[PDB]
Structures are given as C-alpha cells and as structure tokens.
Amino acid sequence: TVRKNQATLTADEKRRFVAAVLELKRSGRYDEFVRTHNEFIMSDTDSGERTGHRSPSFLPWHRRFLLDFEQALQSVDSSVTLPYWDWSADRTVRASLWAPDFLGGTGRSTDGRVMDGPFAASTGNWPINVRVDSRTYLRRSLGGSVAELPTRAEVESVLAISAYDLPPYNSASEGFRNHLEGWRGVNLHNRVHVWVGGQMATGVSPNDPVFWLHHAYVDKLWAEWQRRHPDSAYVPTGGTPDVVDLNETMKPWNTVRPADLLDHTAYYTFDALEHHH
Amino acid sequence: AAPESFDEVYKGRRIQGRPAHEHGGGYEVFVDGVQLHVMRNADGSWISVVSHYDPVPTPRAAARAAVDELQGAPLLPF
Numbered sequence: 001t002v003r004k005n006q007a008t009l010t011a012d013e014k015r016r017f018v019a020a021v022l023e024l025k026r027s028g029r030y031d032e033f034v035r036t037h038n039e040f041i042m043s044d045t046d047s048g049e050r051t052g053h054r055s056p057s058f059l060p061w062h063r064r065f066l067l068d069f070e071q072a073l074q075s076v077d078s079s080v081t082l083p084y085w086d087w088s089a090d091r092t093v094r095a096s097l098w099a100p101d102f103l104g105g106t107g108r109s110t111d112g113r114v115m116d117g118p119f120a121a122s123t124g125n126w127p128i129n130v131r132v133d134s135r136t137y138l139r140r141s142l143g144g145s146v147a148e149l150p151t152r153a154e155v156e157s158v159l160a161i162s163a164y165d166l167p168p169y170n171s172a173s174e175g176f177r178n179h180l181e182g183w184r185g186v187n188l189h190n191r192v193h194v195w196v197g198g199q200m201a202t203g204v205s206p207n208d209p210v211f212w213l214h215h216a217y218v219d220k221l222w223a224e225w226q227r228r229h230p231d232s233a234y235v236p237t238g239g240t241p242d243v244v245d246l247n248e249t250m251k252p253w254n255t256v257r258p259a260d261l262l263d264h265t266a267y268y269t270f271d272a273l274e275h276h277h
Numbered sequence: 278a279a280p281e282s283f284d285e286v287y288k289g290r291r292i293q294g295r296p297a298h299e300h301g302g303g304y305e306v307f308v309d310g311v312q313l314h315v316m317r318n319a320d321g322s323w324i325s326v327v328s329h330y331d332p333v334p335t336p337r338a339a340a341r342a343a344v345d346e347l348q349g350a351p352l353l354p355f
C-alpha cells in the first residue's frame with residue numbers, strides 16, 4: 001500500500017512490477033483497461049457528458065481507474081504497487097525509468113518502434129491490440145513533439161491555485177484541475193502525454209505502461225494540492241448537468257462518487273508527501 | 278456553426294472532412310477512406326484520437342497531424 005517514486009525502486013521491485021504487468025497483458029486483462037480509457041477519451045466532450053477528463057472528475061476518475069489497475073496487479077503479485085514518475089525531477093531520456101530493465105527507452109526514428117526493455121515488440125510479450133494506428137508495436141518519441149517536460153517551478157505555480165475547478169467545468173476552465181490537466185496554462189499532464197509520443201499521445205495511451213506511472217504522479221499532485229489547500233474542496237457540489245458532482249456516482253463503476261475518493265490514504269500512502277505548511 | 282468541408286492529398290494520403298462508444302460529433306474526417314475520430318474543444322481547437330492531447334486549429338490540421346502520426350500506416354476504424 002505504499003506508492004513509490006519510480007526512481008527509487010529496487011531491482012527486485014522493478015522485476016516484480018514488470019512481470020505483473022506482462023501477466024495482465026498475457027491473460028487479456030490489460031487490454032480492457034486500454035479499451036475503457038479510450039471509450040471515455042472519445043466520449044467526454046466540453047459541451048456534453050464528461051467524466052474521465054476535461055472535467056472536475058478527471059482526478060477522482062483516474063484515481064479509481066488506477067486503483068482498479070493496481071488491484072489487478074496485486075491479484076498477480078500482492079507485493080506490487082504502482083510507482084509514480086515525477087516528470088519534473090526525472091526529465092531526460094537518461095532517467096532510469098527508460099532503462100532496459102524498467103520501461104525501455106525511446107523509439108527508433110524511422111517508425112517510432114521501441115527497441116529495448118521488456119515491452120519492446122521484439123520480445124513477443126507486448127502486442128498492441130487495442131489501437132487506432134494499425135501498427136502493433138509499442139512506439140515512443142521521447143521529447144519529439146514537445147521539447148521539455150514541466151519543471152518543478154511550473155508544477156508549483158499550478159499547485160498554488162486555490163480553486164479546485166471553476167464553471168464551465170471543462171477544457172476552458174480556470175482553476176487547479178484544468179491547469180494540472182493542461183488544457184489551459186503552462187500545461188502539465190497533457191504535455192507529458194505529448195512528450196512521450198507514440199501510443200501515449202493517443203486515445204489508447206494506457207498501451208504504454210508509463211501511462212500508469214504518469215497518472216500516479218498526477219494523482220500525487222492532487223494529494224499535494226489538498227495539503228496546500230486544506231480549505232478548498234471538490235466542486236461542483238450538486239445539480240450540475242453533464243458533470244459529476246461531489247456526491248454523484250461515476251461511470252463506468254456507478255458505485256463510487258468523487259466524495260469517496262478525495263482521501264487517498266484509505267487506499268494507499270506515498271513514500272513522501274509533505275504536511276500542510 | 279460547422280467548419281467547411283475539405284478534400285486533399287497530404288503526404289500521399291487522401292484526407293477529407295465534412296460537417297455532419299465515442300461522442301456525437303458534428304464533423305467527420307477520413308484518412309484514405311477510413312473515418313478518423315475527431316473532436317472540437319471549447320476554444321474552437323480540434324484534436325483526434327491519434328493526437329488527443331495536442332490541440333490544433335482546424336479539422337484539416339487534425340487530419341494532417343493524424344497522417345504525420347501514422348507514418349504511412351493504415352488507420353483502423355473506431
């Protein structure tokens with residue numbers, strides 16, 4: 001139940017995380033996560049029903065989605081937890097994240113194909129099945145479509161925003177949620193998807209295992225935001241068309257609300273997370 | 278109010294757009310006759326399912342960004 005910075009995992013932890021991910025893929029369970037995410041990405045709209053992103057529920061929805069995935073990993077190896085990628089600290093292609101004993105590196109230039117690591121197509125262990133681009137190999141172009149990952153100073157500027165979210169509760173919103181998501185402002189989470197490239201830049205972005213580490217860090221930043229703003233809370237708080245209000249249930253589960261997910265410590269803690277100061 | 282339709286060959290591929298499990302979309306794009314899911318954002322920018330996190334100004338720009346992403350590969354239908 002502790003989520004750790006990827007940069008700090010032991011060799012044993014990396015091995016067990018990798019092997020649990022590959023077993024979820026082998027058994028067919030992994031690709032349904034990819035498929036669920038793509039369905040929300042394609043359906044959520046700024047002027048219609050919106051649940052998994054471009055909306056206040058972006059954060060609790062991804063928190064529950066990552067919990068579902070972590071629980072599946074634990075069903076294979078109960079010692080495994082989701083690591084997080086602090087892309088503000090580990091910001092080059094040199095990071096140990098991208099080493100062949102962890103996620104493998106960038107894609108070669110011709111066709112974006114990842115050539116090393118346990119998820120390289122040549123292993124036979126990571127077929128890309130749920131897809132729009134018809135190619136079936138993992139692709140990346142680290143730093144290709146956008147020069148730099150966000151910095152600590154830019155993350156701090158978003159963490160400083162006091163309102164969780166603001167009407168119209170979509171990609172045009174001011175407020176914390178939309179600045180972290182990235183549709184407005186210096187852009188944190190969307191830019192990271194663009195920076196990895198390959199499937200991470202598409203609606204089938206959980207095809208890349210870095211998806212989970214990226215979102216685990218996004219989730220950590222929500223927790224840091226809550227510590228900075230103990231007086232601010234999820235909005236809206238009732239009767240908002242097309243938006244998940246605080247105590248409304250969320251698809252696809254239907255049995256959980258944003259209110260049930262605001263406090264992560266009910267499910268996990270972080271290796272380090274500051275107290276409100 | 279819908280963008281204009283278009284039809285061109287871009288980096289050897291036919292891209293078309295027209296006003297019309299995924300949202301109810303007012304505009305359709307095609308890459309070599311296969312429909313590409315695209316979406317308009319509140320600020321009027323567009324994205325597509327193969328470049329979802331990087332808004333571009335128009336549906337034609339999204340179709341072109343999709344051809345760039347595909348590097349010659351056929352698109353699969355959504």
Ligand SMILES: [Cu+2]
Nearest residue numbers: 037041052053
């Ligand atoms: Cu997402």
Ligand SMILES: [Cu+2]
Nearest residue numbers: 179184185186
């Ligand atoms: Cu801003």
Ligand SMILES: [Cu+2]
Nearest residue numbers: 189193205215
């Ligand atoms: Cu994302």
Ligand SMILES: [Cu+2]
Nearest residue numbers: 228230276277
């Ligand atoms: Cu205080």
Ligand SMILES: [Cu+2]
Nearest residue numbers: 299300301302
């Ligand atoms: Cu649609």
